[PDB]
Scaffold this active site. Sequence first.
Site, short mmCIF file in Angstrom:
data_model
loop_
_atom_site.label_atom_id
_atom_site.label_comp_id
_atom_site.label_asym_id
_atom_site.label_seq_id
_atom_site.Cartn_x
_atom_site.Cartn_y
_atom_site.Cartn_z
N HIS B 93 60.91 76.25 28.64
CA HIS B 93 61.81 75.39 29.40
C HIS B 93 62.55 76.18 30.47
O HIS B 93 62.99 77.31 30.22
CB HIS B 93 62.79 74.66 28.49
CG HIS B 93 63.38 73.43 29.11
ND1 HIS B 93 64.48 73.46 29.94
CD2 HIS B 93 63.00 72.13 29.04
CE1 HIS B 93 64.76 72.24 30.35
NE2 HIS B 93 63.88 71.41 29.82
N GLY B 169 68.84 69.88 40.67
CA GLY B 169 70.08 70.58 41.02
C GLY B 169 70.17 71.10 42.44
O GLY B 169 71.06 71.89 42.76
N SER B 209 63.45 64.59 36.83
CA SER B 209 64.43 63.56 36.50
C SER B 209 63.76 62.20 36.30
O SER B 209 63.30 61.58 37.25
CB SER B 209 65.51 63.48 37.58
OG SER B 209 66.73 63.01 37.03
N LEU B 228 58.86 64.50 29.75
CA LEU B 228 59.92 65.14 29.00
C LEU B 228 61.23 64.66 29.62
O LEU B 228 61.61 65.11 30.71
CB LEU B 228 59.80 66.67 29.04
CG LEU B 228 60.83 67.49 28.24
CD1 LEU B 228 60.73 67.23 26.74
CD2 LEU B 228 60.67 68.98 28.53
N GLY B 230 65.26 64.07 29.99
CA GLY B 230 66.52 64.75 29.72
C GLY B 230 67.68 63.80 29.48
O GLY B 230 67.78 63.20 28.41
N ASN B 231 68.54 63.66 30.49
CA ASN B 231 69.74 62.83 30.43
C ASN B 231 69.49 61.40 29.94
O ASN B 231 70.26 60.86 29.13
CB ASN B 231 70.44 62.81 31.79
CG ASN B 231 71.58 61.80 31.87
OD1 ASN B 231 71.54 60.86 32.67
ND2 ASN B 231 72.60 61.98 31.03
#
Lengths: 247, 246
Positions: B93, B169, B209, B228, B230-231
């Site tokens: 990761h 990011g 994202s 995969l 995330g948030n």
Amino acid sequence: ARKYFVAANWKCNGTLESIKSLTNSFNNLDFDPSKLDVVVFPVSVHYDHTRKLLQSKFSTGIQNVSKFGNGSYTGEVSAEIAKDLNIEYVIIGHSERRKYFHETDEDVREKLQASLKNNLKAVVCFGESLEQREQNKTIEVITKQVKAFVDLIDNFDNVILVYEPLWAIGTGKTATPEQAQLVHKEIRKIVKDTCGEKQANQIRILYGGSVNTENCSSLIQQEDIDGFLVGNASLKESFVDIIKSAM
Amino acid sequence: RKYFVAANWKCNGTLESIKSLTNSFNNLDFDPSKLDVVVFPVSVHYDHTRKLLQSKFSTGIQNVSKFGNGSYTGEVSAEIAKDLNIEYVIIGHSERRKYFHETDEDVREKLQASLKNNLKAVVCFGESLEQREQNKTIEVITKQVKAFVDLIDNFDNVILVYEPLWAIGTGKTATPEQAQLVHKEIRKIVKDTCGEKQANQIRILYGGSVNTENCSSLIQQEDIDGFLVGNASLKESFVDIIKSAM
């Protein structure tokens, strides 16, 4: 007087069945948790299993804690998460993490700050290598290591120090109870001159070298050694005898 | 290919939030033989999460040690995971490459240990903004994949994840079309190194994202076999992302 502190660092070891068998033998030993701290540090994924099997007299903790809080940090266990799970202790700055996982003095500081901010009790490790002792820089290195985090300590019952003679682990040399005491006395002096005399006489300082059933009593006898962070011998059932020496 | 939807909870969650979140996840009816759904909680949450999630959901851990059993404080070996019947591990990761010095050799050694202990692996890779702006996307991904790809003996048990770090990011967006072209190239890398039937078999997931809006446009692409997440995996609306793969 300083409450004695005997800690089992299981490291990267154990199975569900082996922990079941080991925790049963541990439970056969009777002691008062109010006069003696006995803490077990299983693998993170073994924590729930170990906490359920060990009797309430035994304290529990994890072998590492994140320098980061909750957020986008894959593979990390934050201090916030640990407190929610009622995990009491954390190991910070173990030599194996400094050696293999790039853990610096600054990481140790950030971990301690995170832990104390989340009401976790911390077992903080430090020690000099063989090359550093041979260059007569034992105190210089340990002073640098302790001063990296020592100002963060608010309660001196909640932060436990561990000295690791890395000069006597795997190198083929032995550290006597006297040689450990001499460093332990220096560590307490470092705490005294930076935090205060009453604070230095509060703080537990443990010996984190090769501790077994044979030398444990001669190590605990020293004035400035308040217990041990035990490795290999804490995976054996005879670990109860190591607890007996601090009783 | 069997679609694969993974929830990477990262460093998040409380006992109460997980029991609330797992209950909402249990509401969704899917066939685990037709679709893989894996939740990756924090290590100390794993047992709690496994008890609460119904057997349709697979579970795993977010990292695994390159070392076996022994004097490695703070490490979780592949041997220990196998004894706990932990089915899946995440390897490589970006956040562990960025903050924790994890290199391509570490990834290789982690995959070595995982496969030896019959664990299934979700292996992550992807290029930075600097690397994409220098037009080195294919060069970087080829090296990242070729670091481990020869170790795969079962192409249902190793799953690849492309993390477009240039889009995370930075303030730049990754389109489903951009993600597809990379996924196509990854499959071409697997084809050259492992074989034609093997590359047609391996799942390659988008690891950027993902949310309830973009997931369907991403999974409709021929070379993207899931995500995969995330948030968005921390919300009850994660079920809608699973639904897009159904």
